[PDB]
Amino acid sequence: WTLSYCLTKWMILAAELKCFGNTAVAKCNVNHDEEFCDMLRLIDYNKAALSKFKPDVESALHLFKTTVNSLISDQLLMRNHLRDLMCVPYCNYSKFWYLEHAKTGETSVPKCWLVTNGAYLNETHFSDQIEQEADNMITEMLRKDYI
Amino acid sequence: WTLSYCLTKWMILAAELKCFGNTAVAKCNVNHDEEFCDMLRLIDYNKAALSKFKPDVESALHLFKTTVNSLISDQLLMRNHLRDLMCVPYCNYSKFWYLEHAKTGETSVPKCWLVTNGAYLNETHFSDQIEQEADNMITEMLRKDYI
Amino acid sequence: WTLSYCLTKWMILAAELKCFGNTAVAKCNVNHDEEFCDMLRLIDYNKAALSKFKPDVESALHLFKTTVNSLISDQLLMRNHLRDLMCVPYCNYSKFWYLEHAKTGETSVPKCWLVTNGAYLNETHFSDQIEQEADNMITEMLRKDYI
Amino acid sequence: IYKGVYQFKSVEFDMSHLNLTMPNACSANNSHHYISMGTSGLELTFTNDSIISHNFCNLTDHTLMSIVSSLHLSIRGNSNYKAVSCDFNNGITIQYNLTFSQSQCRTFRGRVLDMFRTAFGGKYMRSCGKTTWCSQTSYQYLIIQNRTWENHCTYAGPFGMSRILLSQEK
Amino acid sequence: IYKGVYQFKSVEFDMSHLNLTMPNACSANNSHHYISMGTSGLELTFTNDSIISHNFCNLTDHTLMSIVSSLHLSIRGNSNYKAVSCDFNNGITIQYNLTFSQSQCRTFRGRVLDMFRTAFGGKYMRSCGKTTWCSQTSYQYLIIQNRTWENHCTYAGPFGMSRILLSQEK
Amino acid sequence: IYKGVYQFKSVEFDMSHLNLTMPNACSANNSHHYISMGTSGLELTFTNDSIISHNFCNLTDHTLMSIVSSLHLSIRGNSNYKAVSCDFNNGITIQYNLTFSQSQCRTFRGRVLDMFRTAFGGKYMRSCGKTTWCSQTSYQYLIIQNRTWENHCTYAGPFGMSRILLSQEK
Ligand SMILES: *[C@@H]1O[C@H](CO)[C@@H](O[C@@H]2O[C@H](CO)[C@@H](O)[C@H](O)[C@H]2NC(C)=O)[C@H](O)[C@H]1NC(C)=O
Ligand SMILES: *[C@@H]1O[C@H](CO)[C@@H](O[C@@H]2O[C@H](CO)[C@@H](O)[C@H](O)[C@H]2NC(C)=O)[C@H](O)[C@H]1NC(C)=O
Ligand SMILES: *[C@@H]1O[C@H](CO)[C@@H](O[C@@H]2O[C@H](CO)[C@@H](O)[C@H](O)[C@H]2NC(C)=O)[C@H](O)[C@H]1NC(C)=O
Ligand SMILES: *[C@@H]1O[C@H](CO)[C@@H](O[C@@H]2O[C@H](CO)[C@@H](O)[C@H](O)[C@H]2NC(C)=O)[C@H](O)[C@H]1NC(C)=O
Ligand SMILES: *[C@@H]1O[C@H](CO)[C@@H](O[C@@H]2O[C@H](CO)[C@@H](O)[C@H](O)[C@H]2NC(C)=O)[C@H](O)[C@H]1NC(C)=O
Ligand SMILES: *[C@@H]1O[C@H](CO)[C@@H](O[C@@H]2O[C@H](CO)[C@@H](O)[C@H](O)[C@H]2NC(C)=O)[C@H](O)[C@H]1NC(C)=O
Ligand SMILES: *[C@@H]1O[C@H](CO)[C@@H](O[C@@H]2O[C@H](CO)[C@@H](O)[C@H](O)[C@H]2NC(C)=O)[C@H](O)[C@H]1NC(C)=O
Ligand SMILES: *[C@@H]1O[C@H](CO)[C@@H](O[C@@H]2O[C@H](CO)[C@@H](O)[C@H](O)[C@H]2NC(C)=O)[C@H](O)[C@H]1NC(C)=O
Ligand SMILES: *[C@@H]1O[C@H](CO)[C@@H](O[C@@H]2O[C@H](CO)[C@@H](O)[C@H](O)[C@H]2NC(C)=O)[C@H](O)[C@H]1NC(C)=O
Ligand SMILES: *[C@@H]1O[C@H](CO)[C@@H](O[C@@H]2O[C@H](CO)[C@@H](O)[C@H](O)[C@H]2NC(C)=O)[C@H](O)[C@H]1NC(C)=O
Ligand SMILES: *[C@@H]1O[C@H](CO)[C@@H](O[C@@H]2O[C@H](CO)[C@@H](O)[C@H](O)[C@H]2NC(C)=O)[C@H](O)[C@H]1NC(C)=O
Ligand SMILES: *[C@@H]1O[C@H](CO)[C@@H](O[C@@H]2O[C@H](CO)[C@@H](O)[C@H](O)[C@H]2NC(C)=O)[C@H](O)[C@H]1NC(C)=O
Ligand SMILES: *[C@@H]1O[C@H](CO)[C@@H](O[C@@H]2O[C@H](CO)[C@@H](O)[C@H](O)[C@H]2NC(C)=O)[C@H](O)[C@H]1NC(C)=O
Ligand SMILES: *[C@@H]1O[C@H](CO)[C@@H](O[C@@H]2O[C@H](CO)[C@@H](O)[C@H](O)[C@H]2NC(C)=O)[C@H](O)[C@H]1NC(C)=O
Ligand SMILES: *[C@@H]1O[C@H](CO)[C@@H](O[C@@H]2O[C@H](CO)[C@@H](O)[C@H](O)[C@H]2NC(C)=O)[C@H](O)[C@H]1NC(C)=O
Ligand SMILES: *[C@@H]1O[C@H](CO)[C@@H](O[C@@H]2O[C@H](CO)[C@@H](O)[C@H](O)[C@H]2NC(C)=O)[C@H](O)[C@H]1NC(C)=O
Ligand SMILES: *[C@@H]1O[C@H](CO)[C@@H](O[C@@H]2O[C@H](CO)[C@@H](O)[C@H](O)[C@H]2NC(C)=O)[C@H](O)[C@H]1NC(C)=O
Ligand SMILES: *[C@@H]1O[C@H](CO)[C@@H](O[C@@H]2O[C@H](CO)[C@@H](O)[C@H](O)[C@H]2NC(C)=O)[C@H](O)[C@H]1NC(C)=O
Ligand SMILES: *[C@@H]1O[C@H](CO)[C@@H](O)[C@H](O)[C@H]1NC(C)=O
Ligand SMILES: *[C@@H]1O[C@H](CO)[C@@H](O)[C@H](O)[C@H]1NC(C)=O
Ligand SMILES: *[C@@H]1O[C@H](CO)[C@@H](O)[C@H](O)[C@H]1NC(C)=O
Ligand SMILES: *[C@@H]1O[C@H](CO)[C@@H](O)[C@H](O)[C@H]1NC(C)=O
Ligand SMILES: *[C@@H]1O[C@H](CO)[C@@H](O)[C@H](O)[C@H]1NC(C)=O
Ligand SMILES: *[C@@H]1O[C@H](CO)[C@@H](O)[C@H](O)[C@H]1NC(C)=O
C-alpha cells in the first residue's frame, strides 16, 4: 500500500533512529481502529509527494483537501476530539507506545499515549491495556509458531 | 472507549433490567459492521453529556451535528435505508437479539431484529443466522478455552 | 446483505459464465479493504433496482447521489486515485484475480489486477502476493477442516 | 434455547432519554409527523387544506430554524420559488403546495416526497409489478409548524436527521 | 496453478449494464471524453478552436444539468467570471477558455485541468525528475456539449462521478 | 520489560517535516495561535484591544485565503454581519468583535469560540459540577492576520484542519 518499510531519523523526534517490522505495515492496510496507521499513511504520502513533485503550496493544499479522507481517519479524529471535550484522556497524535520482541524484533501495533490536563498518562494508569496486548500478542505468536 | 459497562433499567423498554458482558463492549471499539455498537455509542455519548454539561438544546444540536459521524455509522444507516426502500426486511434500530451462555453469561454481539411490512420478522425466518452465530460462538468459546 | 449468490453471463465480459462460492459473499458484509466487495455491492444494487422500479434516469441519479457512500468505498477510491496520481500501479476496477480450489470450489476474495502505463501488471510482478494469499488460504482451509 | 446451552432472548431499546442531546424523527400516523429536539418540536402535517396563500416569503429559537433549514436544503434541485409559502412571525409555519402545475417524480411533488421520505423513512406514503421510484401521495399540501412536544409518538432517534444531514446539497 | 492445488484465474467485469442506474465517465482518446447516464450523454471535447464568443452567461433534462452543475462546482476557487461561455438554449454547450491571461497551476487552466483530472482520472493529459502537480495541456479550449450516447467508449462506471461528488466545494 | 520477554518503549513523532504538503494548527500559549502551511502562516491573536473599526467588509496568496474561508464558513449560523471587520489590502487582517450586544452559548461569542475550539482543540480556553457546552473566554477580540512562519510553536499536524474540513456548513 506504500506510495513510495520503517521510519528514519528525521521522523523520530526523541531517539536517533527506530523503526518497526513487516507485521505493522502489513496490518495498516486501510485500518481505522488505530491512529498509528493514520500517522504512517500521512508520512508515506508526504514522502511520496516530496520525491515526485516540485514544491508548491497551493497545489499541495488542494490535493490534501481533495484526498483528506484517504489519509486521516475521520471518525477516529472525531472520537479523540470528543474525548478531549469531556475532560477525558485523549490521543493528540504525538506519542505512541508498543511492545516488541527482544530478539526477533516482533513488534505490535503502537497504541497512542493518552494525554490529559496537558500531561501524558502515567504508565500505571493503562497497565491493564499493556498486559492485555502482551497476552494477545503472545497468543498470536504461539499460533504463528504452530501453523 | 467509554466517555463516562452494561445497560440499566431506563434504557431497556421491555424488561426491568438486563445487560451484557465485557466481550461486546470490547468488540465495539470503532465497529461498523453492527448496529448494536452504534446504539451503545449513542447511549454512552448521551450519558457522558448529561453528567458533565448543563442542559442546552442549541449547543447539544451543534455538537451532534459536528460529531454525527463519530457516533452513527453512516454506511450502515444508508444500507438499512436502501433495504427499507425496496420492500426488503431492514433494521429500524428498535429490537436486537443475541445468544448468551446459561451460566457464565458469555454473550454475543446482538444482531438487529429485521422488520418488514410494519412487523418484526418471525423467529423461523432467520433461524439459519441464529444457528450460524451459535456455531461460530461455540468455536470461539472452545478456542478461548484451549489457549 | 443481498438486496435482491454468484455472477452470471452478462456481468462477465471475457468468459461465458463464472461465479464464486458463499465465503466471498459472506465476507463482503460491509468490507472496505477490498474493491471486489464494492463491485458486488454495485452489481447487487443495479440488479435490485432494475427488477423493482420502472426505468427513470433522474430518479436513479438522485438515489445514487443520496446513497453513493452506501455502495462505493470512498477511501479505497481515493487511495486508488492517489496511486494513479504518482506513477504507481493502481486499481481501475476492471480486472480481478483470485485462487480457487480445484475440486470443492473454495474461492478466495479476488484482488484487483493493478494497471500502470495503460497496461496490466505482469503475473511475475505480484507473484509474492499470490503466494502469500495461497499460504493464508491454505491455513484457513486446514483450520476449517480441524474445527 | 439453542444447542441446549445458549438461550435466545432479545433487547428492546427506549429512545425517550435520547432527547436532550439528540433529535428525534417519527410519524404518529399517515397524516402527522414530528421532529423533536429536547423540549422543542416541529409538526409536519399532511393536510389537504391550505391555510396560507402568500406564495412569497423571505428566508431572512435557533434549533428549530436549523432543523427547518436542513430539511429545506435537503429538497434538491429547484424549489420553483412559487410553491412555498412562509410565516416566520410569532412562530414558524412553512407550507408546501405539492400539486401539479405519468413520471410523477419530475415534479415538485416528487422531490418534496423524496425529502419527506428520506427524513422519515419509507414506512408510510410508500408504494410496494414495477413501482415508480418517488413516493406516492393523495394530499396536496404539506405544513411544517412548531409544536411544544408532548410525547405524541414513540421516540425513534436521530437516524432520520442523520440521513438528512448526509443527503444535503447533492 | 499454484501450490499444485489451487488454480490462478482472473475476473473481467462489464460495465455496459451499469447504465440505467449509474453514471459512466470515460475517455475515447486524448481529445474526447464522455459522461453517460442512461440514454443521456455529455461530450467533453478538447478542441483547439472556439465556437462561442459571448464570454458572459447566466446559470439560471435535469440529469445532464445536475452532472454539469456537479462538474462546475467541482472547479474550486474563483472561475474569474470571464473565462466561461454558455449556451443553454436548444441544448447545453459550455466553453472554457483555458488560456493564460512556470507555476502553471495557479492559473484557471490549472484548476480546470484539476477538475477534468479528478473526474476522468490521470491516464490522459498527465505528466510523469520532478513534475508539477496540476496536469499539463497543449490545447486552449474545453467544450462540454450534450450528445445522445451511442457506445463511443468502453463503459467505466460511476467511480469518476463519485470522486467528483466527494471533491465538491472544498 | 513485560512478561520477561518483550520490552516496553515509546515512539515520539516530529511534525516539522509535515509542512510542505500538510497544514499545521497549534497554539503557542493562551493568547496566540498559529496555522502554517509551507512557508505561509496565519496568526490568530486573542488581544483585548481592537485595531480596526470599519465594522463592514466585502469578502470579494490563495492558500491563506482558502484557510481563512474554511475557518469563516466553519462558524455556523449567522455571523450577524456587524461583528466582523476586514482588511484584505496589503495583507489579510480579519477582526471578530466577540462581545455581548447565562446561556453564554447562544451569542456570537459562543459560536466563534466553537470554531476556534474545533480548529485548535480544547486544551486552552476550555472549562472543566456541570460546565456549559461552549468554551469560555475573558477577552473581547479575535484578530487573524498573516505572519511569515518562523517556527513559533511545536508542529502539531493537519488534524485540526481536518476537523475544520469535516465540520463545515452544518
Ligand atoms: C428526556 O430525557 C431526560 C433525560 O434523558 C428525562 O429526564 C429524566 O426523567 C426521569 C423520570 O422522570 C428521571 O428519573 C431522571 O432523573 C431524568 N433525567 C435527567 C437527566 O433529568 C426526561 O424524562 C425525558 N423526557 C421524556 C418526555 O421522556
Ligand atoms: C393522527 O394522529 C393525530 C395526533 O396524533 C390525530 O390528530 C388528532 O385528531 C383528533 C380528532 O381528529 C383531535 O381531537 C386531536 O386534537 C388531534 N391531535 C393533534 C395533535 O392535532 C389524527 O386524527 C390522526 N390521524 C388519523 C387518520 O387517525
Ligand atoms: C397551489 O397551486 C395550485 C395550482 O398550481 C393553485 O391553484 C390555483 O389557485 C388560483 C388562485 O385561487 C386559481 O385561480 C387557479 O384556478 C388554481 N389552479 C391552477 C391550476 O392554477 C393554488 O392556489 C396553490 N396554492 C396556494 C396556497 O396558493
Ligand atoms: C410556536 O412558537 C410561537 C412563538 O414562540 C408560540 O407563540 C407563543 O405561545 C406562547 C404560549 O403561551 C404565548 O405565551 C406567546 O405569547 C406566543 N408568542 C410569542 C412568544 O411571540 C407558539 O405557541 C408556538 N406554537 C405552538 C403550537 O405552541
Ligand atoms: C385532496 O383534495 C382534493 C381536491 O382536489 C381531492 O382530489 C385529489 O387531488 C389530488 C392532489 O394531487 C390528486 O392527485 C387526485 O387525483 C385527486 N383525486 C383523488 C380521488 O384523490 C383529494 O381526494 C383530496 N384527498 C383526500 C384524502 O381527501
Ligand atoms: C421499529 O419497528 C417496529 C415494528 O413495527 C415498531 O414497533 C411498532 O411501534 C409502533 C409505534 O412506534 C406501535 O404502534 C406498534 O404496535 C409496534 N409494533 C410492534 C409489532 O411491536 C417500532 O416502534 C419501530 N421503532 C422505531 C424506532 O421506528
Ligand atoms: C443498458 O443496460 C440495460 C440493462 O442493464 C441493457 O438492456 C439489456 O439488454 C440486453 C441485450 O439487449 C437484454 O437481454 C436485457 O434484457 C436488457 N435488460 C433490461 C433490463 O432491459 C442495455 O443493453 C444497456 N445498454 C447498452 C448500450 O449496453
Ligand atoms: C478520438 O475519437 C473521436 C470519436 O471517438 C474521433 O472523432 C471522430 O473523428 C472522425 C475523423 O476525424 C470523424 O469522422 C468522426 O465523426 C469523429 N467522431 C465524433 C464522435 O466526433 C477523434 O478523431 C479521435 N481522436 C484522435 C486523435 O484520433
Ligand atoms: C480567451 O482568452 C484569450 C486571451 O485572454 C482571448 O484572446 C483575445 O481575444 C481578443 C478578442 O478577439 C483579442 O483582441 C486579443 O488580442 C486576444 N488576446 C488577449 C491576450 O487578450 C480570447 O478571445 C478568449 N476566448 C474567447 C472565446 O473569447
Ligand atoms: C442536445 O439537446 C438538444 C435539445 O434537447 C437537441 O436538439 C434537438 O434535437 C432533436 C433531434 O432530432 C430535434 O428533433 C429537436 O428539434 C432539437 N431541439 C429541441 C428539442 O429543442 C440536440 O440534438 C442535442 N444534441 C445532440 C448532439 O444530439
Ligand atoms: C492550439 O493552438 C495554438 C495557437 O496558439 C498553438 O499554440 C500553443 O498554444 C498553447 C495554448 O496554451 C500554448 O500553451 C503553447 O505554448 C502554444 N504552442 C505550442 C507549440 O503548443 C497550439 O500548438 C495548438 N495546439 C495543437 C495541438 O494544434
Ligand atoms: C482498466 O485498465 C485496462 C488496462 O489498460 C483497460 O483495458 C484497456 O481498455 C481500452 C479501452 O477501454 C482498450 O483499448 C485497451 O486495449 C485495453 N487494454 C488492455 C491491455 O486490455 C480497461 O479498459 C480499464 N478499465 C476501465 C474501467 O477504465
Ligand atoms: C519543512 O519540511 C522540509 C521537508 O520536509 C524540511 O526541509 C528539510 O530540511 C532538512 C534540514 O534542513 C534537510 O536535511 C532536508 O533535505 C530538507 N528536505 C527537503 C525535502 O527539502 C524543512 O526543514 C522543514 N522546515 C522546518 C522549519 O522544519
Ligand atoms: C505567548 O507567546 C507569544 C509569542 O509566542 C508572546 O508574544 C511575545 O511577547 C513578547 C513580550 O511580551 C514580545 O517581545 C514578542 O515580540 C511577542 N511575540 C510575538 C510573536 O508577537 C506572548 O507574550 C505570550 N503570551 C504570554 C501570556 O506569555
Ligand atoms: C464591538 O461591539 C461593541 C458593543 O456591541 C462596540 O462598543 C460600542 O462602541 C460604540 C462606538 O464607540 C460606543 O458608542 C458604544 O457605547 C459601545 N458599546 C455598545 C454596547 O454599543 C464596539 O465598538 C464593537 N467593536 C468595534 C471594533 O467596533
Ligand atoms: C502579510 O502580507 C503582506 C502582503 O503580502 C505583507 O506585506 C509585504 O511585506 C513585505 C515584507 O518585506 C514587503 O516587502 C512588501 O512591500 C509588503 N507589501 C506587499 C507585498 O504588498 C506583510 O508583511 C505580511 N505580514 C507579515 C506580518 O509579514
Ligand atoms: C478585556 O477588557 C475588558 C474591558 O471591558 C475587561 O472586562 C471584561 O470584559 C469581558 C469581555 O466580555 C467580560 O466578559 C468580563 O466580565 C469583563 N470583566 C472581567 C473582570 O473580566 C477584561 O478584564 C479584559 N481582559 C483582560 C484579560 O485584561
Ligand atoms: C501532545 O501532548 C503532549 C503532552 O502535553 C505535548 O507535549 C508538550 O508539548 C509542549 C509544546 O507543544 C511542551 O511545552 C510541553 O513541555 C510538552 N509536554 C510534555 C509532558 O512533554 C505535545 O506537544 C502534544 N502534541 C501535539 C501535536 O499537540
Ligand atoms: C508517574 O510516573 C513517574 C515516572 O517518573 C513515576 O515515578 C511515578 O511513580 C508515577 N506515579 C503514579 C501515581 O503512577
Ligand atoms: C410466527 O411467530 C409466532 C409467535 O407467536 C408463531 O406462533 C408462529 O408459528 C410463527 N409463524 C411462522 C410462519 O413462522
Ligand atoms: C509478461 O507476461 C507475458 C504473458 O504473455 C510473458 O510472456 C512475459 O514473459 C512476461 N514478462 C515479464 C517481464 O514478466
Ligand atoms: C421579510 O421578513 C420579515 C421578517 O420575517 C417579515 O416581517 C416581512 O414581511 C418579510 N417581507 C415580505 C415582503 O413579506
Ligand atoms: C439568461 O438566460 C436565458 C435562458 O437561458 C437566456 O435566453 C438569456 O439570453 C440569458 N441572458 C443573457 C443576458 O444572455
Ligand atoms: C471592496 O473590496 C476592495 C478590495 O478588497 C476594497 O478595496 C474596498 O474598499 C472594498 N469596499 C468597501 C466599500 O470597503
Question: Which DSSP string corresponds to B48-106?
Answer: HHHTTS---HHHHHHHHHHTSTTTS-HHHHHHHHHHHHTT--B--SSEEEEEEESSS--
Answer yes or no: are the C-beta atoms of D15 and D157 closer than 8 Å. Answer: yes
Give A88→chain B minimum CA distance, Å. 7
Rg, Å, chain C Cα set: 17
Give A57→chain F minimum CA distance, Å. 6
User: How do the domains of chain D map onto residue ranges?
Assistant: 23-166
Task: Describe the crossing of helices E159-166 and E108-120 by its angle, rounded to 10 degrees.
Answer: 130
End-to-end CA distance of chain B: 26
Strands A95-101 and A111-112: antiparallel
Nearest CA in chain A to F18: A46
Type of residue at B101: H
Burial zone of A134 (CB within 10 Å; 0-12 exposed, 13-18 middle, 19+ buried)? middle
How far CA C28 is from CA of A69, C5, C31, C44, C60, in Å, comes to 22, 12, 5, 12, 24
Q: Beta strands of chain E (E only): which ranges? A: 6-12, 23-27, 32-37, 40-45, 84-87, 93-96, 142-146
Q: What is the DSSP string of chain D?
A: -BTTTEEEEEEEB--SSTTSSSEEEEESSSSEEEEEETTEEEEEE--SS------------HHHHHHHHHHHHTS-S--TTTSEEEE-TTS-EEEE--------SSSHHHHHHHHHHHHH-SSSS-----B-SS---S---EEEEE------S----SHHHHHHHHSS--
Contacts of C122 (CB under 8 A, 6+ apart): none
How is chain F split among helix, strand and coil, in percent rounded to 5? 20, 25, 60
Distance from C-alpha of C10 to C-alpha of B124, rounded to nearest angstrom = 35
Strands B95-101 and D6-12: antiparallel
Answer yes or no: are the C-beta atoms of D2 and B130 closer than 8 Å. Answer: yes
Which chain D residues have any C-beta within 8 angstroms of a chain F C-beta? Answer: 62, 66, 165
Instruction: Please name which of B97, B100, B95 lies closest in space to residue B127, comparing C-alpha atoms.
Output: B97
Instruction: Please name which of C108, C19, C21 lies closest in space to residue E5, comparing C-alpha atoms.
Output: C108
Distance from C-alpha of B137 to C-alpha of B108, rounded to nearest angstrom = 7
Answer yes or no: are the C-beta atoms of F134 and F110 closer than 8 Å. Answer: yes
Take residue E102 and report the three cell numbers written for it. Answer: 512556470
| Ligand 6 touching residue B23 (CB < 6 A) | no
Instruction: Please name which of E105, E109, E77, E114 lies closest in space to residue E96, comparing C-alpha atoms.
Output: E109
Q: Is residue A90 part of a domain?
A: yes
Which chain F residues have any C-beta within 8 angstroms of a chain D C-beta? Answer: 77, 106, 170
F66 contacts in chain E (CB < 8 Å) = 77
How far CA A23 is from CA of A4, A27, A37, A66, C130, in Å, comes to 18, 6, 12, 30, 18
Q: What is the DSSP string of chain A?
A: --------TTTBSSSS-----HHHHHH-SS--S-HHHHHHHHHHHHHHHHTTB---HHHHHHHHHHTSTTTS-HHHHHHHHHHHHTT--B--SSEEEEEEESSS--B-PPEE--EETTEEPPTTTTHHHHHHHHHHHHHHHHHHHH-
DSSP class of C94: S
How far CA A121 is from CA of A77, A83, A95, in Å, comes to 19, 14, 11
Nearest to C93 among E21, E123, E157 (CB): E157
End-to-end CA distance of chain F: 48
Residue nearest to atom 11 of ligand 20 (CA): B122
Placement of cell 429512545 in the chain? D15
Instruction: Please name which of C39, C49, C57 lies closest in space to residue C4, comparing C-alpha atoms.
Output: C49
Residue nearest to atom 7 of ligand 8 (CA): E32
Residue D50 CB-half CA count within 13 A: 15
Residue nearest to atom 15 of ligand 10 (CA): E90
Indicate the top mutation candidate among E154, E155, E161, E162 to test ligand 12's pocket, ranked by most ligand atoms within 8 A of CB: E154
Task: Check if C81 contacts A (Cβ < 8 Å).
Answer: yes
Type of residue at C90: Y
Distance from C-alpha of B57 to C-alpha of D37, rounded to nearest angstrom = 7
What backbone torsions phi and psi does residue B75 show, to the nearest 5 degrees? -75, -35
Distance from C-alpha of E49 to C-alpha of C63, rounded to nearest angstrom = 38
D132 contacts in chain B (CB < 8 Å) = none
Distance from C-alpha of F5 to C-alpha of F2, rounded to nearest angstrom = 6
Distance from C-alpha of B44 to C-alpha of B48, rounded to nearest angstrom = 6
DSSP class of F13: B
D77 contacts in chain E (CB < 8 Å) = 62, 66
Query: For chains A and C, what is the number of CB pairs under 8 angstroms?
Result: 30
State the residue range of the domain holding B75: 22-146
Take residue E66 and report the three cell numbers written for it. Answer: 445536475
How far CA C102 is from CA of C106, D95, E2, E6, E99, in Å, comes to 8, 65, 11, 6, 59
Distance from C-alpha of E48 to C-alpha of E140, rounded to nearest angstrom = 6
Distance from C-alpha of B79 to C-alpha of B110, rounded to nearest angstrom = 18
End-to-end CA distance of chain A: 26
Q: Is residue B91 part of a domain?
A: yes
Take residue E22 and report the three cell numbers written for it. Answer: 449509474
Q: State the total domains in chain A.
A: 1
As a whole number of angstroms, the longest Cα–Cα distance in chain D is: 69
Residue D84 CB-half CA count within 13 A: 17
Instruction: Please name which of F37, F104, F47, F100 lies closest in space to residue F71, comparing C-alpha atoms.
Output: F37
Q: Give me ligand 19 centre to Cα A122, in Å.
A: 6
Q: How far is CA B139 from the centre of its chain?
A: 22
How many of the other CB atoms lie within 10 Å of CB of E116? Answer: 26
Task: Check if A75 contacts C (Cβ < 8 Å).
Answer: no
How far CA D95 is from CA of C94, D99, E162, in Å, comes to 49, 12, 34
Instruction: Please name which of B21, B19, B24 lies closest in space to residue B8, comparing C-alpha atoms.
Output: B19
What backbone torsions phi and psi does residue C68 show, to the nearest 5 degrees? -70, -35
Contacts of F18 (CB under 8 A, 6+ apart): A42, A43, A46, F24, F155, F157, F158
Task: Check if C137 contacts A (Cβ < 8 Å).
Answer: no
Instruction: Please name which of A100, A146, A95, A140 lies closest in space to residue A116, comparing C-alpha atoms.
Output: A95
DSSP class of E119: H
Neighbors of chain B with 3 or more C-beta pairs under 8 Å: A, C, D, F
Neighbors of chain D with 3 or more C-beta pairs under 8 Å: B, C, E, F
Residue F89 CB-half CA count within 13 A: 3
Burial zone of F145 (CB within 10 Å; 0-12 exposed, 13-18 middle, 19+ buried)? middle
B57 contacts in chain D (CB < 8 Å) = 20, 37-40, 61, 63
Ligand sitting nearest the alpha carbon of E85 = 9
